[PDB]
Amino acid sequence: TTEIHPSCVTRQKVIGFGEVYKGMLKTSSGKKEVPVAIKTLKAGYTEKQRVDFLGEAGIMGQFSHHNIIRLEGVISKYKPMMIITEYMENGALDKFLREKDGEFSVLQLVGMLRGIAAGMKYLANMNYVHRDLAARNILVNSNLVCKVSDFGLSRVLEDDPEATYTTGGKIPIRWTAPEAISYRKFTSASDVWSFGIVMWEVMTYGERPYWELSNHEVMKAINDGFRLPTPMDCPSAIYQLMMQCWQQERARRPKFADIVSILDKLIRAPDSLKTLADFDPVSIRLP
Numbered sequence: 001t002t003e004i005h006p007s008c009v010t011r012q013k014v015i016g017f018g019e020v021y022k023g024m025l026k027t028s029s030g031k032k033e034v035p036v037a038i039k040t041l042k043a044g045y046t047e048k049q050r051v052d053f054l055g056e057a058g059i060m061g062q063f064s065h066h067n068i069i070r071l072e073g074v075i076s077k078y079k080p081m082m083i084i085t086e087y088m089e090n091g092a093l094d095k096f097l098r099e100k101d102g103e104f105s106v107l108q109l110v111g112m113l114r115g116i117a118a119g120m121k122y123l124a125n126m127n128y129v130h131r132d133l134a135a136r137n138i139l140v141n142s143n144l145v146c147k148v149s150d151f152g153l154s155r156v157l158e159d160d161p162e163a164t165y166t167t168g169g170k171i172p173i174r175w176t177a178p179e180a181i182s183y184r185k186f187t188s189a190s191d192v193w194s195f196g197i198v199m200w201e202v203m204t205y206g207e208r209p210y211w212e213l214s215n216h217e218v219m220k221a222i223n224d225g226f227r228l229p230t231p232m233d234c235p236s237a238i239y240q241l242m243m244q245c246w247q248q249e250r251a252r253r254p255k256f257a258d259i260v261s262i263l264d265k266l267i268r269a270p271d272s273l274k275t276l277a278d279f280d281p282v283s284i285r286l287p
């Protein structure tokens with residue numbers, strides 16, 4: 001983890017306790033300058049807040065993959081402390097899709113999912129269980145590359161008392177596998193369930209999983225065997241894959257390597273994506 005000197009960081013604009021800014025980072029001993037995102041931790045933070053803040057950077061610094069947000073470094077010796085990452089111009093994937101409804105091709109959407117799956121395969125192979133995979137935690141750059149974010153020590157430390165929470169609130173249950181909800185059994189296979197929900201988010205341009213259903217209503221539906229219906233204009237192969245991510249039995253779910261492989265094969269033979277799942281309709285009746 002690279003300690004960055006504050007003289008190398010300028011903040012240009014607020015984009016999101018503390019704040020998140022867009023800024024510039026001078027690197028390579030003053031010879032290079034790159035756009036960055038900058039998250040601060042304001043004075044008065046608690047020990048827990050510090051350990052969680054620097055812990056997310058420490059975890060991010062362990063990864064090096066095209067589909068995982070890249071850490072530039074941290075400012076810990078000066079205040080306010082900062083975490084500095086690459087800047088993703090299009091922000092969170094759920095909002096991005098909700099502002100771009102219907103504008104992408106099926107192949108583009110499937111390619112986004114392949115990138116997310118590659119990042120998740122990498123995480124799982126590192127023995128990192130994400131526990132909060134959702135489109136809100138995926139960022140998108142100007143070239144439409146999707147990268148996983150949102151990391152924390154409660155996911156790796158042994159029997160961490162906060163392992164079942166978000167990086168401190170309740171993990172929104174509608175992305176979470178039944179065995180993680182009911183028994184706190186979070187594993188890469190529960191991340192696969194979440195990935196299936198992300199596939200549905202992507203193919204619907206950011207629809208809310210399960211619409212108006214309350215959390216208890218979602219639990220009722222899933223435990224009765226209900227599953228989210230196909231998105232509109234969705235390839236049958238893509239819907240079949242998300243259904244397999246949602247198998248009740250975790251051992252029946254695909255591994256991330258399987259997901260990456262299948263998505264690759266579909267993209268490479270794109271006629272395979274022209275078979276669409278039937279969209280289950282409202283009754284509008286005309287001649």
Ligand SMILES: Cc1cccc(Cl)c1NC(=O)c1cnc(Nc2cccc(C(=O)Nc3cccc(N)c3)c2)s1
Pocket residue numbers: 015016020037038039056069083084085086087088089090091092096139149150
């Ligand atoms: C700095 C940091 C510390 C710890 C964890 C993480 Cl993941 C990060 N990094 C970031 O939070 C971010 C990296 N890149 C970000 N980009 C971002 C976030 C929110 C909004 C925007 C933005 O400007 N979105 C936008 C603006 C205009 C048009 C479109 N399509 C999208 C861009 S936020």
